[PDB]
Amino acid sequence: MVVEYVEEDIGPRTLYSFEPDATMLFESLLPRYLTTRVYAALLESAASELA
Amino acid sequence: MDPTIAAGALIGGGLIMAGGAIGAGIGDGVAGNALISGVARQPEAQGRLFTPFFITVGLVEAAYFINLAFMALFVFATPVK
Numbered sequence: 621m622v623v624e625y626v627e628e629d630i631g632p633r634t635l636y637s638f639e640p641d642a643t644m645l646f647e648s649l650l651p652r653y654l655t656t657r658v659y660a661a662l663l664e665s666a667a668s669e670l671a
Numbered sequence: 672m673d674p675t676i677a678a679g680a681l682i683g684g685g686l687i688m689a690g691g692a693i694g695a696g697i698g699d700g701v702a703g704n705a706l707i708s709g710v711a712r713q714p715e716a717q718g719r720l721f722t723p724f725f726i727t728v729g730l731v732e733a734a735y736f737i738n739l740a741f742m743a744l745f746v747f748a749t750p751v752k
């Protein structure tokens with residue numbers, strides 16, 4: 621995945637608490653993101669095939 | 672003679688103001704350390720975090736003031752005499 625730093629959006633924003641930590645959550649969430657992307661791809665392909 | 676009581680009030684009284692300052696000085700620290708972090712995590716909390724803070728400090732400062740009073744009672748009244 622390409623890392624693109626879009627904006628700041630939030631400066632004096634209430635900081636998020638991470639449990640246990642941000643890095644482990646991120647590396648455990650990335651494959652779920654990839655597989656939900658593949659799921660959305662399969663759904664779009666099914667709808668396109670029916671059309 | 673009587674001087675041995677006098678210093679007994681100056682030393683003891685000093686102790687009453689030693690353990691006093693170690694009490695408040697650190698207390699107000701360990702309490703305030705939980706305020707800053709709180710405010711550092713969400714600035715809009717400074718409004719409500721003063722409700723617990725100024726309670727703890729209150730208690731803490733009592734432990735100081737009493738000793739303060741007693742120190743006077745030791746240096747300006749010398750009870751055992």
Ligand SMILES: COc1cc([C@](O)(CCN(C)C)[C@@H](c2cc3cc(Br)ccc3nc2OC)c2cccc(OC)c2F)cc(OC)n1
Binds near residue numbers: 730
């Ligand atoms: C001049 O000596 C004090 C003392 C005290 C206290 O000891 C608390 C001291 N801390 C706040 C530093 C207090 C007390 C005793 C307790 C005893 C048990 Br067993 C369980 C909970 C107890 N909780 C307490 O209050 C939290 C207390 C005592 C006596 C009369 C009292 O009525 C005036 C009274 F309030 C307060 C005080 O204020 C100037 N002066």
